[PDB]
Amino acid sequence: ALLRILKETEFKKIKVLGSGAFGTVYKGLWIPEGEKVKIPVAIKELREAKANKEILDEAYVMASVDNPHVCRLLGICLTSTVQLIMQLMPFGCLLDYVREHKDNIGSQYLLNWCVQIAKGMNYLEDRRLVHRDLAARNVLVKTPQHVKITDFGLAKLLVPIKWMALESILHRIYTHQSDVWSYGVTVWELMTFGSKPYDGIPASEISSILEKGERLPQPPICTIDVYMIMRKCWMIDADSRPKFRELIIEFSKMARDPQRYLVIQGDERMHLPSPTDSNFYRALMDEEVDAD
Numbered sequence: 451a452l453l454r455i456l457k458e459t460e461f462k463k464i465k466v467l468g469s470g471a472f473g474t475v476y477k478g479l480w481i482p483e484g485e486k487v488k489i490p491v492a493i494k495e496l497r498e499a500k501a502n503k504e505i506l507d508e509a510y511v512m513a514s515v516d517n518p519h520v521c522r523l524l525g526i527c528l529t530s531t532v533q534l535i536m537q538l539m540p541f542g543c544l545l546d547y548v549r550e551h552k553d554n555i556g557s558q559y560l561l562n563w564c565v566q567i568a569k570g571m572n573y574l575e576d577r578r579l580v581h582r583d584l585a586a587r588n589v590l591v592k593t594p595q596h597v598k599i600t601d602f603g604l605a606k607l608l609v610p611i612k613w614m615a616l617e618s619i620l621h622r623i624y625t626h627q628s629d630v631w632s633y634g635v636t637v638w639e640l641m642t643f644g645s646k647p648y649d650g651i652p653a654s655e656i657s658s659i660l661e662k663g664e665r666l667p668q669p670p671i672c673t674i675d676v677y678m679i680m681r682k683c684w685m686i687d688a689d690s691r692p693k694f695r696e697l698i699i700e701f702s703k704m705a706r707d708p709q710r711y712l713v714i715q716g717d718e719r720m721h722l723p724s725p726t727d728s729n730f731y732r733a734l735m736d737e738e739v740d741a742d
């Protein structure tokens with residue numbers, strides 16, 4: 451009951467919202483049968499990678515996740531292309547969000563996003579779902595206070611070298627501990643307000659600079675405590691890397707004293723919303739950690 455099979459005649463693509471390595475995302479409308487309302491949805495049309503039944507079996511898995519920081523597949527249509535339906539998130543992905551708010555994001559937001567991403571990843575680890583492509587472009591913003599991971603398993607069932615653990619580059623090994631590497635790069639993206647990692651360095655060179663011990667640089671706003679977390683995510687020995695549940699704890703601890711761990715100009719005037727604005731955001735958009 452968690453996956454709705456849609457017929458092509460009950461939804462329509464309206465405008466393209468983006469494209470990626472795996473398909474095209476549309477703003478769409480769902481038109482309930484026998485009703486006169488048009489409900490906005492998001493539609494992902496995949497590129498060609500599988501029998502329809504095997505695709506449906508993978509879809510039931512994507513539809514069965516249940517965690518506030520992980521997107522769930524809601525509906526699917528397999529008549530022509532593979533078309534995936536989920537709730538429309540008007541804020542888009544977190545990478546675009548942080549670039550758009552470049553030096554106007556407080557430390558409380560940044561650290562809470564790190565907590566939320568670690569929580570969704572930890573849940574995927576519990577379900578034995580390896581993401582393979584965690585990055586700020588695959589974290590969706592439901593509200594600025596609530597982010598959600600999408601597209602786990604998409605990489606497998608269908609190449610982000612600059613987000614991949616060394617063992618994934620050299621040997622195509624993909625585990626939860628290689629997702630931890632990508633988590634560290636995702637944290638780096640957030641802390642640099644969406645900088646491109648290893649900008650200007652060709653992808654084919656990343657393996658060699660990693661083996662020489664070079665890593666992404668310390669973001670200007672990060673205290674060493676935050677930067678050490680990222681460095682630990684990029685250890686060559688995958689079993690030396692942090693676990694997602696250890697990352698939740700560490701980033702949650704930091705979120706309780708955020709201005710001690712990130713150094714942001716004007717941070718004092720960039721706190722989380724008052725209870726009034728939070729209640730308003732939740733009532734309108736989100737009916738489903740603070741300083742001490």
Ligand SMILES: CSc1nc(-c2cccc(NC(=O)c3c(F)ccc(O)c3CN3C(=O)c4ccccc4C3=O)c2)c(-c2ccnc(NC(C)=O)c2)[nH]1
Pocket residue numbers: 467468470475492493494505506508509512521522523524534535536537538539540541542543587588590600601602603604605607
């Ligand atoms: C990266 S860009 C991007 N994508 C999307 C998008 C749109 C619709 C659906 C999805 N994803 C899933 O349904 C899904 C998921 F929920 C969890 C895991 C997962 O693996 C998948 C994918 N997946 C597969 O690989 C796959 C293979 C075989 C069978 C079945 C499946 C299968 O379902 C994503 C957006 C987006 C979404 C909502 N609002 C906006 N708003 C603005 C302003 O942009 C953007 N942005």
